[PDB]
Each structure stands twice: as C-alpha cells, then as structure tokens.
C-alpha cells in the first residue's frame, strides 16, 4: 500500500499528493510501517525540508529502534551514522571524490561509454537500454572507481545488477554474497597494496582512521550505490530525452547545454523520493506544529523538486532541487553522478540522432522509488 510521497502516474507525482501539499508544509502522515509508538510527520514544504536536513543535531539519521544496542550497526554506511562518527568517516572518504581526482577518471569514463554504446549498437534494434547501457556503464565505472581488476569487472557487474533486480530471491541472495565476499578480499588486498582504487587513496591518506570492517562495508556500499543509482538516473534521463525529441536535438547541437540539462534530469527524475527518515532528538516548533522527541519525519524530495504543471525543460536556469539531499549527508557521490551524466548524455545523443522508443509509452513498467531508487524496468529503443 504505497505511501502518497512514493506514488507516481508514470514519472509525475499523483493528484492526491499535490493536493495534500497545498494544505501546508507539514502533515500527520504515516509513511513508514510499524510504530505507532512514534508519531509520524510528512514534510513537503521546501524550506522545512531544508531545515530538517541541516539540523542533524536535533534530527538523527539512525534508525528508530526500541532499544539501542539492538540495532544493526552497519559499518561503513555513511548515511546510517550521526556525528561525530560520521564527521570522522566522511572526512576519510571525501578525498576520493575531489574535483581533481574525478578529472583523472574522466577519460576512462569516456572510454567506458563508447565501449558500451558499441555493444548496445551491436545488437540489432530494438534493444533494451536498461540492460545493455544503463546498467553496464555505471557498473563498469563503479568498478574502475573501486580499482577492480579489469578481467573481473564483467562478472562483478553481473552480480551487482542481479542482486538488485532478479525475479528470484535465491539468485538475489547469491549475487548479494558474491559482492560482500569479493569486496572483503579486495579491501584487505588493498590494505597490503594500496593501488588505483578509492580504497587505495583512503589507505594512503587516512589508513589508521578507518577500521577494516568499515572499509569493507563502505567499499560494498559505494559500489552498489554508484551502480544502481546511476543505472536509474541514466535510464530516466534517456527516457525523458527520447520523449522530448526537440530537447534532444537541442542538446545534440549546442553541446554546452549539458550542465543545464544535467540538473534538469536530476530535478525531474528525482530517483530518490525520500532520504532516511529523521528522528527527533529534542522538542522543536516548526511551521505552527510542535514536534516531540519520539517523532519520525519523512522529507519528500518529490514534493520539493516537482510541482503540478512541470515541463521537462533543460533550459531551466534556477534549479533549486535537492535530488542529492542537503546538509552533512548531502550525497558524497554527486560529483561522480554529475560527471557521468555530463559524459554520457552527449555521447548517446551525438551517436543516435534519431534515438527512439521502440514500444508505446504505456507499455513501460516503473520500479517504485519507495524501496531504493525509482526506475524503468525496461527501455526498448530503436534508432
């Protein structure tokens, strides 16, 4: 029974949710299941969402649990920590995402794209864009980013894809363990020998600052996140271009619109519809409502990034979106995400000027964004 902040008509929010938004910025709405020991709050007002995420000190990211020390600790997963642990751990990883270090990666990303678009083009049209382009590209990039040996990348990417979208649970569980197990070896092997990866730079700069188990969970986490998020962001960006062919040719010619378009696909997709629920540590007054210590708030990225009447417009100037969230948890991988879109969208458009949907729009299936990211299951294309 999908909550209102995760319901969509295709890519757009639903009329009932946009109607709820009109009543105010804050709502008595149960988004999370379980409870009702704790009061539920749904946050829809833009300023109010910004304010909660910036106020980590009174709003924690840790999971609301009956007793502490009866929660899964989740080593290496940045969005599950609070300061100071998080302040500590964020500082550890941050170097790997420097503007400098990304620029080094740019050429290998360019290559990965061309190589994947050749394989995509290799199969005759129609081709599913989700399986032969949207998954492999970020998957491979995630492996190069992790310093995964070339001859392993193929297999490891299969497991990443399969652990996230297989119809069968056992297969999901199997591929799931393969990645945990592969990541452990690689992390300890990189402790011995710090190399090209992001595991390498973390050891060479903040080796002692991080425990072995916090490397392994981080590495795995960053690997899966990088892949699945970008698979969804890319597929949706392409779907949006393909169903606005003028907008496409407009970026085709005039390549400099890429940054502007990059923001617009982030805003419009908003593949992350809500960030981790926030838990009140103190009593707080906000927007005429009293929030008590127990209460759990769901921030709606969908309420903030979207409005009734939205048009996909890559020429939008004032993207004030929070697709990457806000505050200390603000996506640490945003520079990689933006780099990928900036490399990838020009390449597809510049290669397939007549890139076209091969089935009717109504035949498209969408993965709900309530678990993980919002996505298209399949994107059949011809050119």
As measured in angstroms, the least distance from the Cβ of 146 to ligand HEM is 10
299 is in an annotated binding site: no
Please state the closest distance from residue 126 (CB atom) to ligand HEM, in A.
26
Is 164 known to sit in a ligand binding site? no
Q: Name the CA dihedral angle for 381, 274, 306, 264, rounded to a multiple of 10 degrees.
A: -50
User: What residues from 254 to 273 belong to the interface with ligand HEM (CB under 6 A)?
Assistant: 271-272
Please report how close the Cβ of residue 358 comes to ligand HEM at its closest, in angstroms: 25
State how far the alpha carbon of 105 is from the alpha carbons of 98, 102, 145, 198, in Å: 11, 5, 8, 11
The verdict on 331 binding ligand HEM (CB under 6 A) reads: yes
Is 336 near ligand HEM (CB under 6 A)? yes
User: Any binding-site annotation on 278?
Assistant: yes
Radius of gyration for the alpha carbons in the chain, expressed in angstroms and rounded: 21
Q: Enumerate residues 110-149 that contact ligand HEM by CB under 6 A.
A: none
Applying CB under 6 A, among 78, 143, 265, 381 the residue interacting with ligand HEM is 78
Tell me whether residue 90 or residue 356 sits nearer to ligand HEM (CB atom).
90
Q: How far is the CB of 211 from ligand HEM (least distance, A)?
A: 17
Please give the residues from 199 up to 218 whose contact with ligand HEM meets the rule CB under 6 A: none
Smallest gap from Cβ 217 to ligand HEM, in A, equals 11
The token duo for 342 is 């900036």
Tell me the closest approach of the beta carbon of residue 241 to ligand HEM, in angstroms. 16
Separation of alpha carbons 17 and 369, rounded Å: 15
Nearer to ligand HEM, 83 or 194 (CB): 83
According to the binding rule CB under 6 A, does residue 337 interact with ligand HEM?
yes
Handedness of CA 192, 224, 180, 133 (dihedral sign): negative
Cβ(226)–Cβ(145) under 8 Å? yes
Taking CB under 6 A as the criterion, the residue among 130, 134, 159, 225 binding ligand HEM is 225
**CB 337, CB 105: distance < 8 Å:** no
- Residue from 74, 174, 250, 276 in contact with ligand HEM (CB under 6 A): 276
Binding site for ligand HEM (CB under 6 A): 61, 78-79, 90, 222, 225-226, 229-230, 233, 271-272, 275-276, 323-325, 329, 331-333, 336-337
Binding positions for heme b are 86, 90, 276, 278, 329, 331
């Amino acid at each position: 029974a999908l909550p209102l902040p995760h319901q969509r008509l295709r890519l757009d929010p639903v009329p009932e949710f946009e109607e709820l938004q009109k009543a105010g910025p804050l709502h008595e709405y149960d988004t999370e299941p379980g409870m009702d020991g704790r009061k539920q709050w749904l946050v829809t007002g833009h300023d109010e969402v910004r304010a909660i995420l910036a106020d980590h000190e009174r709003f924690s990211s840790m999971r609301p649990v009956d007793d502490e020390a009866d929660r899964a600790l989740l080593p290496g997963i940045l969005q599950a920590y609070d300061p100071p642990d998080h302040t500590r751990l964020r500082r550890t990883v941050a170097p790997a995402y420097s503007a400098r270090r990304m620029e080094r990666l740019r050429p290998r990303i360019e290559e990965i794209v061309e190589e994947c678009l050749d394989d995509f083009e290799s199969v005759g049209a129609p081709v599913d864009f989700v399986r032969h382009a949207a998954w492999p590209i970020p998957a491979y990039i995630a492996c190069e980013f992790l310093g995964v040996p070339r001859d392993d990348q193929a297999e490891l990417s299969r497991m990443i894809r399969e652990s996230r979208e297989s119809r069968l649970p056992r297969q999901r569980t199997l591929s799931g363990l393969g990645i945990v197990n592969y990541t452990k070896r690689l992390t300890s092997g990189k402790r011995r020998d710090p190399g090209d990866g992001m595991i390498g730079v973390i050891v060479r700069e903040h080796g002692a600052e991080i425990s072995d188990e916090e490397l392994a969970g981080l590495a795995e986490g960053n690997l899966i996140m990088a892949a699945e998020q970008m698979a969804a962001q890319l597929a949706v960006a392409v779907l949006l271009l393909v169903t606005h062919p003028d907008q496409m040719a407009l970026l085709r010619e005039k390549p400099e619109l890429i940054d502007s378009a990059t923001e617009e696909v982030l805003r419009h997709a908003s593949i992350v519809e809500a960030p981790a629920p926030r838990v009140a540590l103190a009593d707080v007054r906000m927007a005429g409502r009293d929030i008590h210590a127990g209460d759990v708030l769901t921030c709606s990225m969908l309420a903030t990034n979207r409005a009734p009447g939205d048009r996909f417009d890559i020429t939008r100037e004032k993207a004030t979106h929070m697709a990457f969230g806000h505050g200390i948890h603000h996506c640490i991988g945003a520079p990689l995400a933006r780099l990928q879109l900036r490399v990838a969208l020009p390449a597809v458009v510049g290669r397939f000027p007549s890139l076209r949907l091969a089935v009717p729009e109504e035949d498209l299936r969408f993965k709900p964004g309530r678990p993980a990211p919002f996505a298209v299951e399949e994107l059949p294309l011809e050119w």
